[PDB]
Amino acid sequence: SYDIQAWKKQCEELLNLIFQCEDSEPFRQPVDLLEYPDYRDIIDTPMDFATVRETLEAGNYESPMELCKDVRLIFSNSKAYTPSKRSRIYSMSLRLSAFFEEHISSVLSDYKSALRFHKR
C-alpha cells in the first residue's frame, strides 16, 4: 500500500476519534490566559487539537511526522504544567497519549514505506 498521500485522511479520521474521547475535552481549544495567567511563563509553545486539525486542513503539514510532533507537544505541555502526576487533566493526557500512539504507529510506518517505494 504505497500511497504517499493516504496519511492525511488517516490523520483526519484519528483526530475525529480523539474529539469523540471525553479525555480530549481540556485539549480541544487553546488554553485561556485569564484562568491560567502564568501559562506562558511555563509553556513556550501552546498547542491544542483544534490548531492541529486547522493546520492539517489548510495544507500546512508536509508529513504525518510533523503532525505527530505537534500532538506530542500537547502532551508534553500538560506534563510540564501539572503540579502532580495525580492531577485530573495530566491523567486524561496520559490515557489520550496512549490512544494516539497506538493509532499513529501504522500511519507513520505506511507513509515511510510509501516514500521508500517511491525512491526504490
Ligand SMILES: O=C(NCc1ccc2c(c1)OCO2)N1CCN(C(=O)c2ccco2)CC1
Ligand atoms: O485550560 C485548559 N484548557 C482549555 C480548555 C478547557 C476546556 C475545554 C477546552 C479548552 O475546549 C473544550 O473544553 N487546560 C488547563 C491546563 N492544561 C493542562 O495540561 C494541565 C495540567 C495540569 C493542570 O492543567 C491544559 C488544559
